[PDB]
Ligand SMILES: Cc1ncc(COP(=O)(O)O)c(CN[C@@H](CO)C(=O)O)c1O
Ligand SMILES: C=C(/N=C/c1c(COP(=O)(O)O)cnc(C)c1O)C(=O)O
């Protein structure tokens with residue numbers, strides 16, 4: 085329910101029954117063998133898990149510091165980590181008797197992931213997406229339509245992700261009987277922060293096995309970009325009790341932390357309640373609209389488990405600017421032949437700065453959360 | 468050098484020195500423990516091998532016939548089978564002491580795959596691409612640019628794949644000392660048809676071990692699309708000596724085989740000599756090469772690899788065609804029914820597998836080689852609908 089004080093379930097009474105049913109359905113099927121057989125089966129044969137753990141030898145040597153490894157979620161079917169959570173929840177939804185999946189999306193990766201999982205399982209799919217994000221990630225919109233999903237543009241309010249979430253919750257109150265709300269990050273009311281983190285933990289578990297195989301020891305640091313926090317929690321979670329392993333979350337610094345145009349909730353937000361949770365939100369009392377060049381990081385909030393990890397000081401949280409993200413995007417494309425997602429490039433940008441201060445014997449794993457194909461128009465205009 | 472009558476090394480004498488040195492180099496490194504360690508290391512940790520073999524249960528059950536498995540080369544880093552050959556040749560090129568890679572591309576996937584392998588191994592990359600194809604696949608050109616490769620638009624002749632190959636050969640004549648011409652299909656003079664098939668054969672060795680895990684037996688049919696023929700040979704070749712496994716190559720039927728606007732060389736092409744090889748081509752009355760058409764820009768090569776010409780003659784493989792319309796219906800069908808957006812090339816193989824599955828028993832197995840993902844083809848499918 086809570087992580088320290090953070091998290092909770094601050095929702096209208098209409099949503100208590102649904103969320104309790106989800107929580108019981110989950111608690112039941114969480115370790116049902118037939119459920120975990122089907123999940124592993126689709127993750128392996130349809131999604132392509134396990135993803136590899138790539139030693140970036142040229143990047144490492146150019147920096148001349150720590151050994152930089154990349155956990156390659158860019159290679160997951162769909163092109164990002166989001167698919168891991170989309171399969172899990174859609175399978176749960178199907179076993180709960182639901183015939184419809186709804187979801188919010190910003191970058192379009194979760195919307196596509198939900199459409200793909202929906203198409204796979206023969207469920208109807210309606211995706212709520214802000215109009216600024218529709219035009220900014222147009223490829224993902226046509227993919228959702230081709231996958232059989234319906235994309236619903238939200239022009240209201242700020243006309244972006246925050247407002248996409250508001251529309252989806254409004255839908256789910258009206259349709260929860262047959263509709264499952266497939267939330268795409270470690271956000272929202274309980275049980276969602278826990279469910280999304282659990283379905284993303286596979287990343288960290290693989291990466292742990294893979295780095296012991298490659299290097300014969302645990303990594304010194306793990307770096308992952310933080311929007312709502314799902315790819316970061318996924319890779320973080322199985323190393324939480326390895327005290328020697330530092331954990332670093334990288335938020336969108338946008339035009340700069342002192343500019344008022346970023347998405348660093350943990351770094352510069354205030355504690356507050358929104359979308360059913362207590363966590364950090366950017367705010368003026370009223371919640372601020374955020375900015376990032378990476379549309380997947382463009383969310384005022386952040387997941388409560390990160391808010392908790394920051395407070396107990398288990399994880400460190402930093403930021404990286406738009407300019408620094410774009411530079412990591414080109415650096416990685418040219419030096420390693422991997423075109424990263426702009427969200428992921430934040431992680432890469434900080435890992436390259438951090439690698440320089442660390443020694444040749446030391447080890448950093450970067451969660452490469454997605455591929456950059458969706459961002460080609462953005463990087464092209466930015467040029 | 469030969470596959471029956473087909474293949475050979477039909478080139479000018481200036482290309483004989485370069486080809487002999489490549490042929491020598493390959494023979495040396497083909498079985499070298501260190502070369503195969505490095506190739507597999509990059510194929511695993513960087514390219515993401517092995518790819519899975521996916522049972523399309525929903526499509527299977529819709530058709531109500533044979534079991535349809537998809538070999539998921541769409542999940543390979545880059546989004547196509549082309550990366551397998553690109554890494555193999557780029558690494559071979561590096562061990563030969565080359566510093567620069569050139570390649571043709573039509574669809575852009577081979578160019579991207581070459582640009583990727585070149586970035587990985589710290590080599591210069593110039594990609595030859597027909598000006599018609601540059602405008603047609605603008606995003607793949609930007610991907611190549613972002614990867615540090617130069618894209619040289621070809622304005623000579625038809626401004627297509629055939630011409631990009633001709634531009635690439637002219638460059639390689641001059642530059643062979645330090646440049647490797649990285650050909651992206653099982654075409655061209657020896658040793659290219661052999662090398663490319665060898666570097667794509669990992670597809671079939673995986674698919675065989677995977678289908679024996681999944682079903683305890685070999686498949687009844689293997690279906691793959693055929694442009695030049697590399698994704699098809701990759702998946703076919705490990706099954707050649709398993710006599711019970713039928714092999715089907717699916718060519719671009721285009722607007723129709725009788726429309727004069729297609730790319731089925733084996734089906735409606737004539738025997739001929741071009742680009743260093745004796746094989747099937749689409750020809751004019753004079754005997755020169757004819758321009759090809761397909762909605763899938765990857766099946767735009769007017770010829771086809773000589774081992775496919777050979778396999779056809781001895782009747783080991785059957786070759787068929789699928790029209791533009793049938794490939795489009797398969798593109799939408801797989802996306803909606805399985806949540807996999809296939810490349811338009813691959814969609815030809817899916818389209819025929821749907822028709823073949825229907826007229827077969829439930830207990831029979833069809834492996835389709837899903838050669839790429841469809842992210843590159845979204846502009847094309849939008850205009851088509
Ligand atoms: C995804 C995909 N599937 C299939 C093919 C057909 O080539 P093959 O017959 O060599 O496999 C191509 C061709 N691609 C070549 C020729 O246009 C290129 O330059 O990229 C492809 O991109
Ligand atoms: C907001 C979205 N994208 C998020 C995203 C993120 C940020 O979400 P998490 O912090 O939950 O991983 C990171 N990396 C990639 C590739 C992403 O697409 C979305 O797909 O709706």
Ligand code: NA
Nearest residue numbers: 347349383385
């Ligand atoms: Na945020």
Ligand code: NA
Nearest residue numbers: 132134515517
């Ligand atoms: Na894999």
Ligand code: NA
Nearest residue numbers: 730732768770
């Ligand atoms: Na052809």
